[PDB]
């Protein structure tokens with residue numbers, strides 16, 4: 001069936017859209033080639049519509065059925081509970097999309113009578129009615145990228161499809177416990193969202209070492225959300241239903257599946273009918289869990305079809321990496337084609353065709369790769385990095401323009417040991433926080449799709465707990481990593497190391513001069529910038545820091561605030 005049908009009504013914005021990085025003294029000090037940085041807008045929604053719209057053909061075989069049976073068996077070991085209206089309300093981001101029924105996210109969080117009553121009525125309706133398609137809004141996302149000259153043309157806007165706030169709270173009540181606990185039970189060590197960046201590195205390295213002649217590949221599905229069929233979504237529901245659930249949960253899950261998850265009408269911000277969806281909704285609670293299960297099922301079966309030897313998968317939504325035993329270069333290329341053919345039959349055709357890789361450092365998954373640097377003792381150590389282009393472009397935008405959610409803070413947290421997060425992101429943003437006297441102000445950021453309020457002054461202990469003390473003393477980064485950063489700095493027009501070091505020393509001195517948590521930031525985050533090093537001992541606050549909850553599950557598109 002067609003992933004989408006369209007009426008001709010436009011996908012409309014509801015606020016002004018800026019497409020060019022503005023000229024701004026603060027962002028200019030970070031990167032001067034502002035014309036390289038753009039944001040997507042509703043103007044390119046038509047381009048995206050064409051890309052996401054196609055007929056899916058799906059044929060299922062014995063391998064598919066076998067894997068599904070195994071997954072259901074694991075799912076049957078899971079007991080999940082309904083959330084109360086209170087608990088669900090508390091998971092709603094403060095700035096989540098308001099309801100069309102006269103209340104917003106703040107009212108939901110405050111347990112406002114108008115909010116809570118409508119939620120109860122939506123829930124009751126889910127129980128009474130298991131057929132009527134539920135309305136969704138479709139919007140073009142405004143996301144920031146750098147121009148890729150070698151590729152041609154800007155990325156068009158991604159779309160988001162989401163039901164009303166009232167429905168989203170009901171999804172949490174029925175399914176929050178399921179989507180938080182089920183994936184790890186079903187997929188075990190293959191479930192990527194259970195890992196911190198360091199734990200992800202550990203899993204990848206150990207998996208690589210477990211093979212005699214390791215070979216790995218990332219598999220890019222062409223528009224994964226759109227490839228997801230009614231069958232796939234019903235199969236996901238059948239997996240959910242294997243859980244030990246309350247009767248009202250079972251009914252609500254069945255209802256949400258029939259009325260929302262399988263498909264439904266698309267409405268623009270002007271209230272006009274834009275068309276109809278028969279694929280994954282990108283803005284529902286089950287997007288991440290559904291994609292992860294479905295990607296895992298199809299890939300596991302395709303591994304068997306391709307007769308890959310000892311395939312180990314790591315899955316995060318639609319992001320898939322496979323590590324296996326090499327059968328030789330020609331044999332590997334042939335087996336990857338068979339894998340691709342199998343995935344295609346399952347309705348997960350390739351974007352870029354998968355390529356066998358024999359160096360672990362060259363495998364990119366979740367937009368990231370393992371690399372090597374040296375710790376204080378000179379020992380080679382593994383850590384997670386990524387190309388810094390998008391992080392830096394977004395940092396520049398977030399410098400020039402105010403936004404609730406700050407990718408830069410998430411990037412510092414997740415990539416704290418990296419050359420670029422330390423040299424550039426920490427230096428740049430602490431200089432701004434110093435200038436603004438806003439070090440004490442908590443900021444919102446995203447980790448694995450969930451939103452968190454984080455105090456920048458807590459960064460030293462957060463980094464220690466997450467990455468260890470070595471994050472503050474890594475040096476001698478790999479030539480490949482240094483070269484990649486070098487290319488980025490040239491492309492974006494970012495100042496060189498000598499400039500960042502100078503800026504960092506000044507930032508550090510000021511932080512130190514202020515005492516308290518500010519001084520701890522100066523000492524630990526910027527020790528790299530000084531000749532006369534300070535001794536970096538374990539921070540007492542880090543030992544009593546429970547960073548569990550951060551890496552339990554993925555919630556991208558799921559409207560989750562922790």
Ligand SMILES: CC(C)Oc1ccc(CC[C@@]2(C3CCCC3)CC(O)=CC(=O)O2)cc1F
Nearest residue numbers: 419422423475476477482485486496497528
């Ligand atoms: C990209 C290239 C043209 O320039 C650089 C080369 C190396 C580095 C790393 C410098 C280093 C890090 C420490 C954390 C931030 C800067 C690590 C290192 O090996 C020595 C050092 O003085 O600091 C940055 C650079 F910007």
